[PDB]
Design a binder for this molecule. Structure first.
Ligand SMILES: Cc1cc2nc3c(=O)[nH]c(=O)nc-3n(C[C@H](O)[C@H](O)[C@H](O)COP(=O)(O)O)c2cc1C
Ligand code: SF4
Ligand code: SF4
Ligand code: SF4
Ligand code: SF4
Ligand code: FES
Ligand code: FES
Ligand SMILES: [Mg+2]
Lengths: 230, 217, 431, 42, 62, 59
């Protein structure tokens, strides 16, 4: 058909036109690190965690947003892409708070897991961290914006999936904040899912607060019966 | 340095959603023209101008003004909130009728722009970001203003006062206090960022139309 | 064949009304040769105009330096169904730069004519001018020039006896340096906050309102009609190969006569300062450092600026780049670390902050420079700072991160001994 | 000639001059193109 | 504390393929229920769809 | 360094240091620690149950 042949670490794969680098890497069998990309949301290209090296290309590209073209060789484990991941995680963790023991997302945090796998193990940040005031968007979602990494994933989910446009970004630069800018409650029948999409503990479940840790829990796959959707 | 301006809004008797704000009919005509500029179906592209107009009618931007602009343009109010909190020329707090802005970036800082700021400090008796008790002047330190070559310079309500000295800014402040409007532009007998005594370019009378048109045209 | 540049005759310049000594309205523009035989140029077709621009060797004056003929040719694709727009970048945010403001306040009709000619070559339906919000009086002057053109029939209904319809719109920003970036500028025009968007898609395919678009500097579009009228070869005579043309220079800082001046491209920096600027304060030996192209370009010391040319390639050879041709000079009686720290603070204030590298790393670099200014750090940190810059550079969405990383890199590379001495002094005095 | 400054006029600009001129120009301009719908939210 | 009575509460076995697991279950004499693997279907992602001229994929902010 | 009987400490103000992070429960080789937590009256992250089986502990 109209499939184009690309290479991931020298292994050929046939992909449709318009496919991104991240999706081709998925097809070969690799998961590119990500913080702002969600397959169910629109592409943002903010966190810059998915930076990967194309062979014979002097600049790293964003895998989640860069469509792939015929003949590229994607070098996911090259020293350039590894250094890019380490630098991006260093920048992400520079202003993050030391709240892991008191965070509800201890053993199920993408920031922690991707720092363990794709980041360094020590800091060279000798400054004072920032702190922002917590918002209050209702009794269902507990808000601690000091843990926010500004991936703008909740904003996209609210605007597109939930059709509710009260979330947004106020400010410019390092003191840019996510919220409503007013005392407003983010109320919708799909409001709890911002807890799931948020990779960090900035948004958590208030009724679940402090109750358990992920490794303790046993998971049973079952069916909802609150309505006829099942 | 840290900004200090909050990016969250708390209801105030002065700044609450019930605060009366509306556009005068002339501002309605201006809004109509502004929307007429942009293609059909993309009225949101008029958020920045119309909001500015609201400020020019009120002097600052309460939450009521943001809500009114959002209602007029049929856009979610949060979008107007982001636009207002992103751009620095939007005043989300009341300011004095004369808004003094001093440029202290490296090209201005090199030509002793701190002296002019300190002269303003002494003449007004207020700190860098405060407001005079009579609500006449508001001092703010800003970034580059596009007049680097003719530094140091200040901006007071859409006017540029350039090539300043402490004496010059003292005179401008006292003249603004008196009531009359000072003449904008560089001081020290200079017009339009020309060399002070060089005049190394643009000395001959300019040539007329079609001086060097090539053949075939 | 020519080896020495820097003697540009008065009659051979472009912006003859740079200093505002003549009338800036339609009558003055007619007296100076503007709006002359514009109808013939419009009728000669877009292909001829693009060919003239390509043979002219013009490069973008916004700072990127990309050849404008190639960009406009990329814009020259056939129709799609959507309208096509031309955007002129009059944001003028980068510190040390004052030329776009002058050419828009004192000679706007060249800008209007260039907008019309560029739109004709580009197939553009209309032109949007994104002027800096702080520029109010000159925005009004440009609006008056546009009204005079509209009344005379120079733009709008057939714009000439040519049959081509073109509109020119003026849009004012609101205090945001990042809005000068082409994608951020498009975002701001579209009524959103000025955050640059990723590429692809490029503006030539998806731009303003989702329509094909190309963003150009004021100087580029302003010189395009004169290039077309006098021919590409005449412009290509000046400067070196791949560096042809005349350039507007702003000279600021520690000079006797800071000024703006149009000069041949590859003029040596020293004679440029000594001729038009009146020389460094206290003589040439007093010079300490110079930033040749605005805050984004790295600084260079006296030793290399003694015998350096002023164009894209020769400045890249000096590891700096021409940028926007904004010369900022500093003599030996100043704190260079303080100046670079101020520039980094400006970049910290003016980053939109949507991508993690620029936001976080630029705040980090601002803090590290603030600590360096008083010497509170230790030398082992200097290399660390270098590493931090290399993490910002090339990993961000737009070039603001690059433009914030480069000044730190230049300062470190050329005055590491100054930082080390300051650290030693602080350590000794505080014990 | 070049000795005299010919740009003393920007001394007499009001706070509504830009918008007034936009209103004046509004009726010299051609109809805008359309995307077929009132907004992306429609 | 939480007390239990069956021995097989914490017993979870890992298998490479479905057929291997089913063979193990049949060999050990256990009645089994199998449900098929769920894979996320591929999706057409495009950044340029955000800035749409006439479609509804036009994002309000970013 | 000698390690004998266990104890739960508190801050000089007199308010207990334990924040119910459950790391001690997860690291315990003998599974001798049982923890249950909930938000307090002031919203503090505190344990409502913290048991150590000293017949299971290996010290
Ligand atoms: C942070 C930033 C600010 C910029 N500001 C301006 C500006 O004020 N004026 C300008 O012409 N270009 C500016 N640029 C460069 C633009 O990308 C450039 O104008 C655009 O590519 C078109 O320029 P050209 O006419 O040289 O092709 C800026 C770039 C960045 C990254
Ligand atoms: S969000 Fe993740 S990394 Fe941040 S404090 Fe919570 S658990 Fe730790
Ligand atoms: S709150 Fe969570 S999902 Fe929303 S922007 Fe911050 S980190 Fe992303
Ligand atoms: S580099 Fe800075 S200004 Fe540019 S998009 Fe990223 S955060 Fe914004
Ligand atoms: S739960 Fe255990 S590890 Fe966590 S604070 Fe309490 S005693 Fe310490
Ligand atoms: S996942 Fe691609 S930049 Fe965030
Ligand atoms: S540095 Fe002062 S106007 Fe730019
Ligand atoms: Mg979460």
């Amino acid at each position: 058909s109209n499939l184009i042949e690309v290479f991931v670490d020298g292994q050929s794969v046939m992909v449709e036109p318009g496919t991104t680098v991240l999706q081709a890497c998925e097809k070969v069998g690799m998961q590119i690190p990500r913080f702002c990309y969600h397959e169910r949301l629109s592409v943002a290209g903010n966190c810059r965690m998915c930076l990967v090296e194309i062979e014979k290309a002097p600049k790293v590209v964003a895998a989640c947003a860069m469509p792939v073209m015929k003949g590229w060789n994607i070098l996911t484990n090259s020293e350039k892409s590894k250094k890019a991941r380490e630098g991006v995680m260093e920048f992400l963790l520079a202003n993050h708070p030391l709240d892991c023991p008191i965070c509800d997302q201890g053993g199920e945090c993408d920031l922690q897991d991707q720092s363990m796998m794709f980041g360094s193990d020590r800091s060279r940040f000798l400054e004072g961290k920032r702190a922002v005031e917590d918002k209050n968007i209702g009794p269902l979602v507990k808000t601690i914006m000091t843990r926010c990494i500004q991936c703008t994933r909740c904003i996209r989910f609210a605007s597109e999936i939930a059709g509710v446009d009260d979330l947004g970004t106020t400010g410019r630069g390092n003191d840019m904040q996510v919220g409503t800018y007013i005392e407003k409650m983010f109320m919708s029948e799909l409001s709890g899912n911002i807890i799931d999409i948020c990779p960090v503990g900035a948004l958590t479940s208030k009724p679940y607060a402090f109750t358990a840790r992920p490794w303790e829990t046993r998971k049973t796959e079952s069916i909802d019966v609150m309505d006829a959707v099942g | 340095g840290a900004g200090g301006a909050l990016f969250v809004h708390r209801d105030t008797p002065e700044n609450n959603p019930d605060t009366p704000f509306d556009f005068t009919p002339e501002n309605y005509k201006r809004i109509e023209a502004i929307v007429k500029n942009y293609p059909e179906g993309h009225k949101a592209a008029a958020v920045l101008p119309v909001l500015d107009l609201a400020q020019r009618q009120n002097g600052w931007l309460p939450i009521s003004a943001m809500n009114k602009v959002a209602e007029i343009l049929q856009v979610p109010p949060m979008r107007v909130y982001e636009v207002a909190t992103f751009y620095t020329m939007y005043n989300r707090k009341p300011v004095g009728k004369y808004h003094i802005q001093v440029c202290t970036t490296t090209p201005c800082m090199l030509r002793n722009s701190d002296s002019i700021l300190e002269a303003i400090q002494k003449k007004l008796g207020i700190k860098v970001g405060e407001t005079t008790p009579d609500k006449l002047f508001t001092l703010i330190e800003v970034e580059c203003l596009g007049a680097c070559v003719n530094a140091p310079m200040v901006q007071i309500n859409d006017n540029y006062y350039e090539d300043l000295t402490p004496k010059d800014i003292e005179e401008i402040i006292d003249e603004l206090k008196a009531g009359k409007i000072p003449k904008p532009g560089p001081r020290s007998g200079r017009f339009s960022c020309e060399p002070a005594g060089g005049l190394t370019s643009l000395t001959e009378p300019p040539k007329g139309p079609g001086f060097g048109v090539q053949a075939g045209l | 064949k020519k080896t020495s540049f820097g003697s540009l005759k008065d009659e051979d310049r472009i912006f003859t009304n740079l200093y505002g000594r003549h009338d800036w309205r339609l009558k003055g523009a007619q007296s100076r040769g503007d709006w002359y035989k514009t109808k013939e140029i419009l009728l000669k077709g877009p292909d001829w105009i693009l060919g003239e621009v390509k043979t002219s060797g013009l490069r973008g004056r916004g700072g990127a330096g990309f050849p404008t003929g190639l960009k406009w040719s990329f814009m020259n694709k056939p129709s799609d169904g959507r309208p096509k727009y031309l955007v002129v970048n009059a944001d003028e945010g980068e510190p040390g730069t004052c030329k776009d403001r002058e050419i828009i306040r004192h000679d706007p009709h060249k800008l209007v004519e260039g907008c019309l000619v560029g739109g004709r070559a580009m197939g553009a339906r209309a032109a949007y001018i994104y002027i800096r919000g702080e520029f109010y009086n000159e925005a009004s002057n440009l609006q008056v020039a546009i009204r005079e053109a509209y009344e005379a029939g120079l733009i709008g209904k057939n714009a000439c006896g040519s049959g081509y319809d073109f509109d020119v719109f003026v849009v004012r920003g609101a205090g945001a340096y990042i809005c000068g970036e082409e994608t951020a500028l498009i975002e701001s025009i579209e009524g959103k906050q000025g955050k640059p968007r990723l590429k692809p898609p490029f503006p030539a395919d998806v731009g303003v309102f989702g329509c094909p678009t190309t963003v150009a500097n004021v100087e580029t579009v302003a010189v395009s009609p004169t290039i077309c009228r006098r021919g590409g070869a005449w412009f290509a005579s000046f400067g070196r190969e791949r560096n042809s043309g005349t350039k507007l220079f702003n000279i600021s800082g520690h000079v006797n006569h800071p000024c703006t001046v149009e000069e041949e491209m590859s003029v040596p920096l020293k004679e440029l300062i000594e001729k038009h600027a009146g020389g460094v304060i206290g003589g040439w030996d007093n010079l300490l450092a110079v930033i040749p192209g605005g805050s984004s370009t790295p600084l260079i010391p006296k030793s290399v600026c003694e015998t350096v040319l002023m164009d894209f390639d020769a400045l890249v050879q000096a590891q700096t780049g021409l940028g926007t041709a904004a010369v900022i000079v500093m003599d030996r009686s100043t704190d260079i670390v303080k100046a670079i720290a101020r520039l980094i603070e400006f970049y910290k204030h003016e980053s939109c902050g949507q991508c993690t590298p620029c936001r976080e790393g630029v705040d980090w670099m601002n803090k590290v420079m603030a600590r360096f200014v008083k010497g509170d750090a230790r030398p082992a940190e200097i290399d660390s700072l270098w590493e931090i810059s290399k993490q910002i550079e090339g990993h961000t969405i737009c070039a603001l991160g690059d433009g914030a990383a480069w000044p730190v890199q230049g300062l470190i590379r050329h005055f590491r001994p100054e930082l080390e001495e300051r650290m030693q002094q602080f350590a000794l005095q505080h014990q | 000639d070049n000795s005299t400054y010919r740009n003393l006029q920007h001394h007499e600009y009001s706070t509504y001059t830009f918008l007034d001129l936009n209103v004046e120009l509004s009726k010299f301009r051609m109809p805008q193109p359309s995307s077929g719908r009132q907004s992306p939210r429609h | 504390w939480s007390s239990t009575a069956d021995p097989l509460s914490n017993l979870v076995l890992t298998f490479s393929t479905k057929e291997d697991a089913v063979a193990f279950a049949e060999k050990n004499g256990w009645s089994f229920d199998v449900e098929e693997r769920k894979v996320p279907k591929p999706k057409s992602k495009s950044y340029g769809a955000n800035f749409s001229w006439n479609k509804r994929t036009r994002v309000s902010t970013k | 360094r000698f390690r004998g009987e266990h104890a739960l400490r508190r801050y000089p103000s007199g308010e207990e240091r334990c924040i119910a992070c459950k790391l001690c429960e997860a690291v315990c080789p003998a599974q001798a620690i049982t923890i249950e937590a909930e938000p307090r009256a002031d919203g503090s992250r505190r344990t409502t149950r913290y048991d150590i089986d000293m017949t299971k502990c290996i010290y």
